Amino acid sequence: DECANAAAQCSITLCNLYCGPLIEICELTVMQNCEPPFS
């Protein structure tokens, strides 16, 4: 999925692109593994 890839890519800019509700767990995971907001 794109939402999955977005998290795997450590990007908020991808997270929001498709994750909808999962934006939260997406951003959360990206926080968890990485230093968002992605550039």
In a domain, 29, yes or no: yes
In a domain, 7, yes or no: yes
User: What method did the depositors use to determine the structure?
Assistant: NMR
How many residues would you count in the chain? 39
Tokens of 31: 């926080």
**How many whole angstroms separate alpha carbon 31 and alpha carbon 22?**
14
- Domain ranges, residue 6: 2-33
Radius of gyration of the chain (CA): 8
In a domain, 38, yes or no: no
Q: Using alpha carbons only, give the angle 39, 4, 7 rounded to the nearest 5 degrees.
A: 30
CA 32 to chain centre: 11
**How many whole angstroms separate alpha carbon 3 and alpha carbon 35?**
18
Per DSSP, the residues of 2-23 read HHHHHHHTT-HHHHHHH-GGGH
Number of domains in the chain: 1
